[PDB]
DNA sequence: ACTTGTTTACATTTTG
DNA sequence: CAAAATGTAAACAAGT
């Protein structure tokens, strides 16, 4: 098991991201590629990821431009919590 | 059928 | 000795 908190994995997925933002499935793919450990039991840890993403205010939800209206929004970091490293 | 998102509830962990 | 951070499970609502 990798030694990172779920909040750290989301943060790390968003920073390595191009646009410094990520859809949900972007976070998932980053975590699943980077660590094959999270290839097993996706349902449980992806619930923990949604729980952390919703509950932690350091993460901010960014919709599409104007009316993009896609399946989810993007996710980004807060310009105050990004000082905290992983 | 599912994905996404919010929230509650409870268990575990980690140091003043 | 709670407390705060964190993990896990789960019920539930809104959405081409």
Numbering used by the authors: 181 to 266
Text from the published report:
To compare the binding mode of FOXL2-DBD to the TP53 promoter with that of typical FBEs and reveal the unique binding mode of FOXL2-DBD, we determined the co-crystal structure of FOXL2-DBD in complex with 16 bp DNA (5′-CAAAATGTAAACAAGT-3′, hereafter DBE2 DNA) containing DBE2 with GTAAACA as a consensus motif. Interestingly, the stoichiometry between FOXL2 and DNA was distinct depending on the DNA sequence (p53-DNA or DBE2 DNA). Highly conserved residues (Asn100, His104 and Ser107) play a role as key interaction residues with DNA. In addition, Ser107 bound to the phosphate backbone of T6′ (2.6–2.7 Å) (top). Notably, the side chain of Lys124 was deeply inserted and bound to the base of T3′ toward the minor groove of DBE2 DNA (bottom). Cys134 formed a disulfide bond with Cys111, connecting wings 1 and 2, thereby decreasing the flexibility of wing 2 and bringing wing 2 near the minor groove of DNA, suggesting that disruption of the disulfide bond would be related to adult-type granulosa cell tumors. FOXL2-DBD bound to the DBE2 DNA with an apparent KD of 0.79 ± 0.1 μM and with 1:1 stoichiometry, which is consistent with its crystal structure.
Forkhead box (FOX) proteins belong to an evolutionarily conserved family of transcription factors expressed from yeast to humans, and possess a highly conserved DNA-binding domain (DBD), called the ‘forkhead box’ domain. Most FOX proteins bind to the typical FOX DNA-binding element (FBE) 5′-RYAAAYA-3′ (R = A or G, Y = C or T) to regulate the transcription of their target genes. Analysis of crystal structures of FOX proteins (FOXL2 and FOXA1) bound to the p53 homotypic cluster indicated that they interact with a 2:1 stoichiometry accommodated by FOX-induced DNA allostery.
